[PDB]
Every structure is written in C-alpha cells, then in structure tokens.
Amino acid sequence: VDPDIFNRDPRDHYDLLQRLGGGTYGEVFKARDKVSGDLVALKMVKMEPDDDVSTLQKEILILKTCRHANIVAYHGSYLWLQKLWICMEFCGAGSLQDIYQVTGSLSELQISYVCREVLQGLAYLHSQKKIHRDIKGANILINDAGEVRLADFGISAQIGAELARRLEFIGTPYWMAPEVAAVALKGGYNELCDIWSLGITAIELAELQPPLFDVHPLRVLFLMTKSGYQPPRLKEKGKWSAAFHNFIKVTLTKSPKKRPSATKMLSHQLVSQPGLNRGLILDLLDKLK
Amino acid sequence: DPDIFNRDPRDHYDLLQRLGGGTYGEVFKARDKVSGDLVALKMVKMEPDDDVSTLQKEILILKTCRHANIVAYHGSYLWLQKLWICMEFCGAGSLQDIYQVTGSLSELQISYVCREVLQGLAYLHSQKKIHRDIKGANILINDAGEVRLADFGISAQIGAELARRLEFIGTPYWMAPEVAAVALKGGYNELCDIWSLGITAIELAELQPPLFDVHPLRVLFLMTKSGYQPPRLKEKGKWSAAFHNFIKVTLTKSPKKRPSATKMLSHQLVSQPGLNRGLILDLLDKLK
C-alpha cells in the first residue's frame, strides 16, 4: 500500500480526541501529539490482507507526491491490526461548508480569493497529471493560518484504481475503435471537469447550496445529457458584480472543448482583481469566533 | 430472467462434446432430443454469492433479438448450480475456424460477409444495442453458408458495468455534464462496431488483424494519439478500389464522421449484384 508506511499503532504517538466525521470513505479523528500537543487529522480505513489495496495505495501516492500550498498537508500513514490511518493536516476552521453554515454567504471578494486559491491547487494537480473530481465546499479547508487547502482525494483514488483495473481486463485490442481505446486509457473525460465543479462551488459559497439541490439526483444527471441543457446561474443577479456572473458563465461552459483550463482561469477578471489577500480569510475566521 | 427453466437441460438435449466458450463460460455442442437439430449450450458455473447482472444482461440481449443474422435463442436452464444458455449451432463454426484451414477469403466472399454483418449491426443498433466484439471469431457460418453474429459477452459485461456506474455515482450536484454523460452512456457509441467490421474485413483478407505482431499496450497507446493513421490493406493490387474505399470509410478515425451500418449498406462493395450464400458454400467446399 505504501513503501513509507509505519507498521505501528498511531495511538503510540497520538491521543485520539474525537471523531470529527468522514470523507468519501473512512472515519476522520481529531488527534493530538502526546508530547508537543500539535493537532492532526487521522483518517482510518479498514484494511484486511484480502482487500484490494489499489484505492488507498493511490490516495497515499497523490497525497505524498503533492507539494503544494493549496493542498492539505500529509504527514504519513500507519498500518496496525488491519486498520490504515492516514495522517493529515488538522484545519482548525474545518471546511468552507462548516464556515458558511455559521457565517452565511461569503462576500464576493472572499469567494474570489477562495476561487483563486483553488485554481492554483487545480493548476498544480493538473500539471502533475491528476484530477481531483470532488471539488466542493466540504472538500476545501481553511487552516488557522488562513490558507485554502484542497482535501479528500478519495474519489480521485477510486477513479484511478477503476481505470487501472479496466486496462488489466481490456483484452485483445486489435479490432477496437480508437475512441474505445481512448476511454480505456484516459476515461472519456479530462481535468476540465474540476473547472465546472469550481463554478458550482462558487455558487454554493454564495447561496449555501449548489444549484438544483432540491431536485432528485437522477433527474439532475439525466437533464445534463439532454440536448437543450442550459448550465446553472446565480439566483440573485443584483447581489453580485458582472465579474462574478462571468466567472460562473465561463467555468460552467457545457462543452469541455471550450471550458478554460485552470491556468487560463487565473487571468480571469474575478480572480486577478487587486484586493485578494489572506486578510479576507483571516477576517472570515474572526467572524466565526 | 423470469422465463428460466428450472430443469436439467439433459432432459431435452443430449450433450455431445465440449467446444470451449468465448468471453466467458464453456460451450457444448448438443442435440435436441425431439428434432435432432444441433444447438450450442453455453454453461456458466454458479455460486450462491454471485453477481448475476452480466448473465442477466446477456440473456435479455439474446431473448429480445429476432433477426436472421444474429444467433437464435432457445431458452436457458438453471440446474445443479449451473446456468445453460441455449443458442443456434452453426455447423461450419466461425470464420476464424474456417480461414485457419482455408487461408485468405476472396473479395466477393468478404463482401457477402460484410453485407450480412451490417444487416445484423443495423438491427442491433436500431434496438439500442452494441456488439463491441465484432471479429472473425464472432461471425459464425452455418452449413447453408449463412452468417450469424455470436457472443454478446463483452456487450453484457459493458451493460452490467454501466448499470453499476449509475448505482455508485454519488451526489451529482457538482459533477460536470460530460462526467454525468459517460456515467449514463459510456463515452463511445455503436459506431465502434463499424470500425471493428473494417478490421474484420482486413483480417478475412490477410489472416491477421492489422498490427497483430505489435504488443497490445503499444497498439492501444498508438490509437489514442492525434496523429494515428487508420490501417489499410497490404497488397493494393490484389483488391478493387471499392474494397479499398470500404476499408477507408469503415475505418474513419473520428466517430462523428464514421457512417452508420444502414449508410454502409448502400456502399458499392456490399450493394453489388452477385452477393449470396453460394460464395460461402464455395469457401466450405474448399474446407472439405
């Protein structure tokens, strides 16, 4: 699962303080270093010798090979008595969903700053051939230093593992059409799917819910496949500037061939504005207390 | 399937010999006890904690097919931990079994085969089905020189895989439209069968599909490049311009420009006047 794993009980180094919740899979615990007192988040997953180790192997590999200020910090992993423990940064404010349900709608400048920081994390991930595939407020954390960090590579790991399995059982390819060979090797979609999720997340930070949240999940999926499909928009026009409406319009470009990349989005009017600094986030954290 | 017979298939058929299956299972040559007709019985072993989704999709595809160019379905039996799918037996086996003894097929024999496969393909696509495994091994020839498509194994596996995507997709509110589209539809369409028929036409002509001596992973990688050139027949002088054009048109790299099976039925190669089962009866005489 990981050549750098510690075959030791994490409870030798950490006091488990409380079960904070969970992600796509696993259970997350708040933990404290026994001697220093430093806080960490320990994600525990059941790991038997018979289980497929590929998903968790890929999640650890993404966390270990990410060296970025906009990606949650990784400290190491533990394997002890059929339980895998992934040790990561403990972000004191929690997720942006934890924040906006107490604080309400973020201001346009706070959203602009979060979007820029997320786009820097996405530009980095995409440059290293990775796709997050689960961009949303619940997966964007704010640490005590006011930094915006992408978290939960669970879906990304599951998708990488599913793609490796498909290649293993693809069979003889001599009669396969090139587009069949392409979805077997790449998947049918690309990293631009993360740009659309950031557009939906910016609406979620403004409205406390993604668009169509009240609509049945299957109806949402079917409508996206229909011919006359129109992407979502911000509900209250006058509350937001034209730069925010345009950010939603371009990130939510229906065709992936015309959806801008993460680096191209960094020069967009909304995220290239002058007043975007960590002070906006430190002031968001002050409102929480 | 609700119409599954809960009896031993040996009550109605005499098992004659094991022949080996396709994608999955084992196929037995068998004889109908009342008519003396041969049938192919596909046997799949069962275990109590087995996912029955793929098997269920294969039976449903076969039970709803009613076309001369697709193996006929005669029912399925569940007995003593085994599932038996009963289908049409084709006396000469597959085109691969034939050309391995006979050698290369003539252009007119290939044109008859292509027309018959396109009739089956046009039918399958009209019913919203995809074969996905068109090749010499899956095109059977009966004693009368007639053509039947066989082995909906890959087709059933893909269908089962796609149904399992719709079940474990999770909340879709942050999901881009193209991600939603591949989860429901798959990322490719029925036009993949047109390409496979082009490669199959080359396989019948040259005894191997193009790049057969190149590593499978290298072939897969080459195809994804934006400079990949579709294959062509090696001996230009051995074939007519119409066959060379059929190959170029079926092997259109872009699935947006690749013609449908119904469109291909109007192509010169397969709409020619002398195409009939007699051409395959000549092939079978060469075998004996």
Ligand SMILES: C[C@H]1CC[C@@H](N)CN1c1ncnc2[nH]c(Cl)c(-c3cccc(C#N)c3)c12
């Ligand atoms: C416990 C989780 C989920 C519930 C959320 N309300 C708060 N959250 C965190 N809070 C404080 N520090 C944290 N560090 C990390 Cl990593 C997470 C985190 C957040 C989201 C997904 C995953 C995973 N896979 C981990 C975290």
Ligand SMILES: C[C@H]1CC[C@@H](N)CN1c1ncnc2[nH]c(Cl)c(-c3cccc(C#N)c3)c12
């Ligand atoms: C026994 C099989 C496999 C080996 C091949 N050499 C000859 N072949 C047939 N030959 C004569 N009639 C047949 N009818 C049917 Cl159906 C098949 C068939 C062919 C291929 C796959 C499957 C399945 N699932 C069934 C068949």
